[PDB]
A and B are shown apart, each in its own frame.
Chain A
């Protein structure tokens, strides 16, 4: 049971740029490390094993180095074919403890999110549970924050968040959050509002609706 801290969690580099990922070990491991790559929803591959020796088959851009107990992976330059996640490893103390994980996504210009709110459908009232949706589309970066306020009262502990992955054309993200509320509670309040906070906006944007 050896914790393998790995940083940075996220990165964004344009094509043909050097990038380095560092994986650490709390204890000392006798140069027994690997470095796996994983495309989304596919079997992870192997790039570097031992400590700095490349594995036959992968391009020669990828290489590794050792320094005490702080290993690092070096990329000479990123072709548009290695935008995936990389996991470090140690194989000198069973059980094997994989690292947290690193994500390397495409970089582009910042984008301004747009906000939209969808009132619950009339049919949805029949089910007895009311739901509202606040939508963000074609913005950047992944990092974003949205909070729910009803009748100028904060709402917490009941909401969902999900965002698509990098778009092959726009290289942006879209965020959708769903609030589920009981039918009885729905009529209790009158004012529903969605607040969005993002680095691309001056001040939070308020989108609200009434019945």
Chain B
């Protein structure tokens, strides 16, 4: 696709269901396009992945 018709920031897809216990490290990602974005890292697979930041306990833990 042409670059102009594309979206670029740490991640565009959110994992709908995430295990709270497996969560091990959340990175606050700040960009001028997607603004506030959250990057996590699950211990089950030990691979960085994003979660919908609008989850209730993410705000409680983060903000």
Are any A and B Cβ atoms less than 8 Å apart in their complex? no
Q: Which residues of A contact B (CB under 8 A)?
A: none
